Amino acid sequence: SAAGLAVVLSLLASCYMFATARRKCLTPYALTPGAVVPVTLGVLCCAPRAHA
């Protein structure tokens, strides 16, 4: 069961490090009154579906 628990404490860590790298790469694009650079729309799932 410890191996059944070392999965969930090692599959959340690799999911935590994508949400952080998703955040830090597009946080200035949400602060300005500007666009999203639609290449990064394709690669990163951005919250501006096209809005804000």
Binding site: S10, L11, S14, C15, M17, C25
Partner: peptide, 29 residues
């Protein structure tokens, strides 16, 4: 067991391999 701990053992070092590269770029700019 090596197949289980080699998949998400190899997923985790690729998740660091992004975040080392992203903080190398968007600390600079």
């Amino acid at each position: 067991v090596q197949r289980v701990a080699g998949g998400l053992g190899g997923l985790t070092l690729a998740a660091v391999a992004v975040l080392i590269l992203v903080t190398c770029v968007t600390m600079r700019r």
